[PDB]
């Protein structure tokens, strides 16, 4: 064939830290469908937002919003435990159906997005150009959010390890962990990946007794 219908830009959802996670890649022939499992960002999270985006940028905010919906009634559980299946299905007429279903509760929500939605030919071309021109910057942003989430994972696992130990962890150790946790908290608000990792390192260097418990 010399011609066919494609979806012209990547389609995905916003994930923790403001990154766009792609479900359908740009130039995929239509009709198409793809599903991926997602989980919750925080402990005890009973609801998630499914924000549908079109574009090639790593920052969710730089892509075109197509719509959004909430999925509630998730049983409060530790982060990463819920299994939320997100499905993108584009029919032959370019109509996009997005659904999210929580495996444990069976709760499901969906949205229909018209074929005329999103970016026009000129905006599609500008999207592709802007993504290529910002390839390195977008990669650095993705690496920063990965470290910010990891830094928050180290902050989460440390604080949980402190509470379980309680009286067992010495004073000199606990107070120095607390000060290293705040230095990590402050660096996480910044955009310097190495600064965050150095604060994580400084935390680990004062958590030696905490790890043994």
């Amino acid at each position: 064939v010399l011609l066919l219908d494609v979806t012209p830009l990547s389609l995905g959802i916003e994930t923790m830290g403001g990154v766009m996670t792609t479900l359908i890649a740009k130039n995929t022939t239509i009709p198409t469908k793809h599903s991926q499992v997602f989980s919750t960002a925080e402990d005890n999270q009973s609801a998630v937002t499914i924000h549908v985006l079109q574009g090639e940028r790593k920052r969710a905010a730089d892509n075109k919003s197509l719509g959004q919906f909430n999925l509630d009634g998730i049983n409060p559980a530790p982060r990463g435990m819920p299994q939320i299946e997100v499905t993108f299905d584009i029919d032959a007429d370019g109509i996009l159906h997005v659904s999210a279903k929580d495996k444990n509760s069976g709760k499901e929500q969906k949205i229909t997005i018209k074929a005329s939605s999103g970016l026009n030919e000129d905006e599609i071309q500008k999207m592709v150009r802007d993504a290529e021109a910002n390839a390195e910057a977008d990669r650095k942003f993705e690496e920063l959010v990965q470290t910010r989430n990891q830094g928050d994972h180290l902050l989460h696992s440390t604080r949980k390890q402190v509470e379980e130990a309680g009286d067992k962890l010495p004073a000199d150790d606990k107070t120095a962990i607390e000060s290293a946790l705040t230095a990590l908290e402050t660096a996480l608000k910044g955009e310097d990946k190495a600064a965050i990792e150095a604060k994580m390192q400084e935390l680990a260097q004062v958590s030696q007794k905490l790890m043994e418990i």
Binding site: T15, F38, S39, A41, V48, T49, N70, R79
Partner: peptide, 9 residues
């Protein structure tokens, strides 16, 4: 690892 989602507004 499955990617993670934020809670509504």
């Amino acid at each position: 690892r499955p990617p993670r989602l934020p809670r509504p507004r």
